[PDB]
Amino acid sequence: AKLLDRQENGFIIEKMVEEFGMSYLEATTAFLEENSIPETQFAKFIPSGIIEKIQSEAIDENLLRPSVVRC
């Protein structure tokens, strides 16, 4: 009944990037959808370790306003 353990979910995530070879972003965007978790709750279900690897994609891909890249 409890998914809480992020580490768990985190290890569970990179599994998808290793197999489905999708973008860390798309991946974790999906993981959430599949478990019915709103993005606004990513904090309690996603490991801040895997987040970092999204932040990285965002910059490398310029998905964000230069304004936010800096801070």
Partner: protein, 228 residues
């Protein structure tokens, strides 16, 4: 052959919020954003080619249009992350030339950016300067004559040149049509000096005051490109 092609970039109010003219544009490399000034506008004298950004504009996206992939990173980075889409004004395909002028019009009410202010600030220094030199002439002139007419009739030759210029208007002369001359000079000076001053006003009024643009439009940036 050669001609000045006027290209405009307009930012309006949308049903989804106000547009922004800025260098803070997403989905474009440093290469593109590099060539722009702090205000998102291209540099005068730039050798621009088809595609290059001339004026950076941005438009709010609105829920409906948000991919769940961006709803997520919006939640990660805060509201103003993937808030807007690039709608900046680029150089059309095929065309090539060199920017020779830009012209920023801002509606009455909108906050003036840094770029705008410096320009505003500069035009004030002048409007003011223009007055000093205007006034210096007015004095140097009329006052050369007041002396002349003053000396002739009641000469303080050396005495007069000492007391500050503002003290001359004071001194009087033996009743005479020569006192009526000294009368008009006084009137003229003041009346004119005043007029010149209330002109500085009407100038400052215009410089700072907004531009009368269409309803909805917030600011317009007109780039002037020399196409060969």
């Amino acid at each position: 052959m050669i001609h000045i092609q006027e290209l405009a970039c307009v930012s309006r109010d949308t049903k989804l919020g106000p547009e922004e003219i800025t260098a803070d544009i997403p989905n474009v490399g440093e290469a593109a954003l590099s060539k722009l000034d702090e205000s998102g506008i291209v540099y005068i004298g730039a050798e621009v080619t088809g595609g290059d950004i001339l004026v950076g504009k941005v438009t709010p996206k609105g829920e409906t249009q948000l991919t769940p992939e961006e709803k997520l990173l919006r939640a990660i980075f805060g509201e103003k992350a993937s808030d807007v889409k690039d709608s900046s004004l680029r150089v059309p395909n095929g065309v090539s030339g060199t920017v020779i002028d830009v012209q920023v019009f801002t509606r009455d009410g909108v906050e003036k950016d840094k770029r705008a202010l410096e320009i505003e600030e500069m035009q004030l220094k002048q409007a003011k300067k223009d007055l000093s030199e205007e006034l210096q002439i007015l004095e140097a002139g009329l006052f050369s004559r007041i002396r002349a007419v003053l000396v002739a009739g009641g000469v303080e030759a050396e005495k007069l040149d000492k007391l500050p210029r503002d003290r001359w208007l004071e001194l009087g002369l033996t009743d005479e049509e020569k006192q009526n001359q000294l009368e008009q000079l006084a009137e003229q000076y003041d009346e004119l000096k005043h007029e010149f001053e209330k002109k500085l006003e009407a100038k400052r009024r215009k410089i700072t005051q907004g531009d009368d643009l269409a309803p909805g439009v917030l600011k317009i940036v007109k780039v002037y490109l020399a196409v060969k």
